[PDB]
Design a protein around this ligand. Sequence first.
Ligand SMILES: Nc1ncnc2c1ncn2[C@@H]1O[C@H](COP(=O)(O)OP(=O)(O)O)[C@@H](O)[C@H]1O
Ligand SMILES: Nc1ncnc2c1ncn2[C@@H]1O[C@H](COP(=O)(O)OP(=O)(O)O)[C@@H](O)[C@H]1O
Ligand SMILES: [Mg+2]
Ligand SMILES: [Mg+2]
Length: 723
Amino acid sequence: QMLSKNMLLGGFDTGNIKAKISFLNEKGNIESFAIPTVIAEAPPAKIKDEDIELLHVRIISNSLDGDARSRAWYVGAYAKDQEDRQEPQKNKKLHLIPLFTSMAVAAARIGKEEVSVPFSGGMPGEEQILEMLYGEHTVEFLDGTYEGKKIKITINDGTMNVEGVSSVLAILFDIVNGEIVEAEIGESYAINDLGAGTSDNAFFEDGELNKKLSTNTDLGTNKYIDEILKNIKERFMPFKTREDFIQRLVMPEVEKMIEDDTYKPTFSVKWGDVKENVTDIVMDGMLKYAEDQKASLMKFWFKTNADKNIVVGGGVLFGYAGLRDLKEQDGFILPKNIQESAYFTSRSYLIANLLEQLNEQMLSKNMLLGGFDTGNIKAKISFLNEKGNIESFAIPTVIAEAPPAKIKDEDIELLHVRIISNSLDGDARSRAWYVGAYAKDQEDRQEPTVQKNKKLHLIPLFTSMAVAAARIGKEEVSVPFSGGMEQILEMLYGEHTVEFLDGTYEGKKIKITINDGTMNVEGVSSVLAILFDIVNGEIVEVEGGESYAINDLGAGTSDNAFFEDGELNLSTNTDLGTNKYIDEILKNIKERFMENEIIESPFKTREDFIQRLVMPEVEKMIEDDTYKPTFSVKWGPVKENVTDIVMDGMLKYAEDQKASLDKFWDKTNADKNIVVGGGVLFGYAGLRDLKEQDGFILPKNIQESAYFTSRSYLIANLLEQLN
Ligand SMILES: Nc1ncnc2c1ncn2[C@@H]1O[C@H](COP(=O)(O)OP(=O)(O)O)[C@@H](O)[C@H]1O
Ligand SMILES: Nc1ncnc2c1ncn2[C@@H]1O[C@H](COP(=O)(O)OP(=O)(O)O)[C@@H](O)[C@H]1O
Ligand SMILES: [Mg+2]
Ligand SMILES: [Mg+2]
């Protein structure tokens, strides 16, 4: 139960204008207050929310400049009324002092002069930060409610809760004595802390933060407050601080609107002796701020295509007159312990704080048998697992420089590895990388450019072998390499390590030995996947010459090969890839979405359009040839049926390939055209119908049509080992 034991559990949101803090006091619930980031030099002796009203403290901190080392300061809303004020390394003293004060004030509320604070802040490295706060500090009150009290604060460890996970806790949980549940959100959502200086827009798909679309803007309440105050003065033809104007004139009226939905607000301010009714001068600024945010919020909604939009902060309370319109539109979630909206961030850090504080055959029992189709976009690999059949996946040929330390078919959707190969060069020879779709969501990405390069191809290949080895539960495998059309495939013999710094194989170190190799240069093995399959053992495929042609339909190009007597001949490749067809489908879908209400695109990348929208329907179509597909796209709040646009692009692609296919059959006159690659699955809607006329053969299993090239290389590898 109770960790105290002298522990102050708190969440701390330090910004440029206020220092918000949420802490467990004596009772077990949550208390919260804010100290403006303001400090003013003070004489060494004296000269509800009563505490922050007057903060005159002397701080003896070893995290301090020495200069402010042990000297007196005015802190907070009291420092505001000084003219040696300081307002936002340089100068850090401005942040650390009002923070230590809040801890002292918090500790004093629970009646302790020595408290140990596991620091749970947030960044608006990161052991880099906590070492700035570590050690023990003393805060002596020279005045105020705790006049003469000396609070001693020891900071041990902590979390910076930049992890993103913690930023959404205050909407799912609450602390009342014992921890409560308020999951009704989606797996993807936007969080918008509406601040006084800045509007912070964050987006979270899956579990955590998508910092490609995440932004910080200058849409704060200050500018609007500043103009309201100005016009008030122009009507008197004051309030000294912005905050003063909020707590006195504004904060009352807002809550009456909260206590009661039909309440008419009334802003009147007396100056000196005169009472002027400024009920509309305030309302305009309030409603105008409201408008700009809904504009801003909706733009970010279409940008992220989030399923839920959470709106928190004090900007909600300030613009509540116009922002209460959001309770009616779904996609938008206020937390409706709504007075607590301002401290939503600090509450989140408090909950998270609390949480961590709670603490024939073959035999192959160390050989990795794989066929490798390493390309310009995907590093496709087909390998044998324990059970003895073929598993296949593809790793996006994209890498990104990574920190050497931590900070189905989805063990590869967190690939953080270090590659130690003799085949690497630069200082890549000894450094960590983000591999696969994750140098996608990183701006230090490197992607193939039309050499070195080279590291760009070797790393996803070695990682693919890793994932394979780690999958069959071996902490290292001998790999007979089977690639495809003098080498420097001995970049690749010798031996290679890959160590998982994260992901499903956290801490697993996978070290790879390559000693043999074949290129399957002849084309005869490039077609092996349609005559054979490996199910536990090796079998001939259910229903199958002198010569045959092959059409691999890729993303970038459609390649044509011709084999006679099995042997490779007349081979060409057209840039008749799926990419331009997909791009103009996406182009068309987006433009059917451009009316009545509609910032970029509903789908994040080309892969996103396929993995989510397309290949589900294709699977229903493969399993059932009478099934009508239904392609529907949701973008923000808009749900439109784009079945036409997707089917049209598929069918045009189907004909264009058929047009190209028939031509290549004419010049080579092969007995058999085999159509393979991923383009088969994309244009399957029309290629399943045109298959019966032109007279060519598609492979079954057809779901694995993409890995056909890598599959054939695997069989050639297996056949090889059988001598
Ligand atoms: N209950 C309330 N009624 C009216 N205005 C409020 C209320 N609570 C906070 N505000 C004001 O809303 C504005 C939003 O600022 P805030 O969200 O506190 O910024 P920060 O991100 O620094 O915490 C502030 O100027 C604050 O004074
Ligand atoms: N299961 C699937 N359903 C529909 N389309 C797919 C499927 N798998 C892959 N594709 C698409 O087929 C295209 C070709 O993929 P692939 O042949 O692997 O490209 P490359 O060989 O050039 O790397 C890709 O654009 C991809 O989006
Ligand atoms: Mg804030
Ligand atoms: Mg391909």
